[PDB]
């Protein structure tokens, strides 16, 4: 075909805090490798760094990446170019309209990857708060990704290797525990795992 194809047709989500850096790097990579992927953040608001630590640029979820881009450009185009935010926002715009909050989505997934335990917990808490009415299993997996541009890309590679492995399973529910441990031993990373239900 014209594109790579996931034989398991997994529906995947990747989740971070602001749906800006880590989840979007993973979104882009996963999509290019042919996966059905969506991305979200778990924070109350979208938060990008500013010119001072105590002066973040904060927006509501739903604010178009394009508008955040314009906002920072007029603030100080050169500063937000050198620190990488304008490129990040540009990459994001090409993927989708705006940052989305996981707790507000109605989409369902076979696998949800989170990029730090705080996000993992919010995702799991949110899933548990919902009365399951289908008994459709979903696997939440946490893979720690350090929050900067370089490590976000590295995380995208690692997360993609993990999803690729699980996609090759013909019965994920009965294989996944063993596959997670194999991945942990080979890649020397801890994966947090929960099985929840829609």
């Amino acid at each position: 075909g014209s594109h790579m194809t996931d034989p398991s047709k997994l529906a995947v989500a990747v989740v971070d805090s602001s749906n800006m850096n880590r989840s979007m790097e993973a979104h882009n990579f996963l999509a290019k490798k042919g996966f059905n992927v969506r991305s979200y953040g778990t924070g109350e608001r979208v938060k990008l760094p500013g010119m001072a630590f105590d002066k973040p640029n904060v927006y509501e979820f739903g604010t178009k990446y394009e508008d955040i881009y314009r906002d920072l450009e007029s603030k100080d185009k050169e500063f937000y170019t050198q620190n990488g935010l304008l490129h990040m926002l540009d990459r994001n715009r090409r993927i989708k309209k705006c940052p989305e909050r996981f707790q507000d989505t109605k989409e369902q997934f076979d696998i949800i990857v989170t990029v730090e335990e705080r996000v993992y917990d919010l995702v799991v808490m949110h899933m548990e708060s919902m009365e399951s009415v289908d008994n459709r299993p979903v696997h939440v997996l946490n893979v720690d990704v350090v929050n900067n541009a370089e490590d976000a890309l590295m995380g995208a590679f690692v997360i993609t290797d993990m999803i690729n492995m699980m996609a090759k399973s013909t019965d994920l529910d009965n294989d996944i525990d063993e596959l997670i441990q194999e991945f942990e031993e080979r890649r020397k990373r801890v994966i947090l795992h929960s099985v929840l239900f829609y």
């Binding site: 749906n19 938060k47 630590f53 990040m88 929050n147």
Partner: peptide
């Protein structure tokens, strides 16, 4: 925490 982290 911001995305990315403040540098």
């Amino acid at each position: 925490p911001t995305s990315p982290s403040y540098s």
